[PDB]
Each structure stands twice: as structure tokens, then as C-alpha cells.
């Protein structure tokens, strides 16, 4: 989750909106297993 602890404080003459992007990856102990063909692509030829 992502809660608010204090409302966003601007100085005067500053737009009071912003954006927060989110990034993700995997650590080093990440393992896999039995192969399987995919599902997202649908058609053929």
C-alpha cells in the first residue's frame, strides 16, 4: 500500500501536483522450473 503521512506542501507559485512512478525487478535467488509455451500471443501464421 501507499499511505499519506502529511499533505503535500508547496511554496506559493508552484503547481501542487506530482507523479510517482514505480519500478520493479528481481533479486539474485530467483529460480525457475518446467518450460511452458505462452498464452498472451493468440493467432497463428
Amino acid at each position: 500500500t501507499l499511505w499519506y503521512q502529511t499533505n503535500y506542501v508547496v511554496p506559493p507559485e508552484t503547481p501542487g501536483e506530482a507523479y510517482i512512478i514505480a519500478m520493479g525487478a528481481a533479486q539474485d535467488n530467483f529460480t525457475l522450473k518446467i518450460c511452458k509455451d505462452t498464452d498472451e500471443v493468440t493467432q497463428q501464421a
Binding site: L2, V10, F30, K33
Partner: protein, 48 residues
């Protein structure tokens, strides 16, 4: 994301993930946030 794509192959998987946030505001502003994780047994929290 990419790690959400190759896991559509490879029927089972395990490991640890990190999540990185970053911010796109002006230099003057300042506000605190709370980034909380919940354990996978139960539902999401309700209050602060």
C-alpha cells in the same frame, strides 16, 4: 513489466523481489509518505 513476461513461461517460480519508487516533483516541495507491505495471509490494511 519484463519479470511479469518471462514468468508466463516457466510454470513454477520462486525468489525475492525488490520494488523501487522515485519521485518527479519540484525542488522546493516536501512531504512524507508511508510504504507498507502486508503479509500474504490476510487482506489489505484499513487505516494508518
Amino acid at each position: 513489466t519484463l519479470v511479469g513476461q518471462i514468468c508466463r513461461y516457466y510454470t513454477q517460480w520462486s525468489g525475492s523481489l525488490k520494488v523501487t519508487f522515485m519521485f518527479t516533483g519540484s525542488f522546493m516541495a516536501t512531504g512524507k509518505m508511508l510504504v507498507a507491505y502486508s503479509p500474504p495471509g490476510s487482506a489489505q490494511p484499513a487505516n494508518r
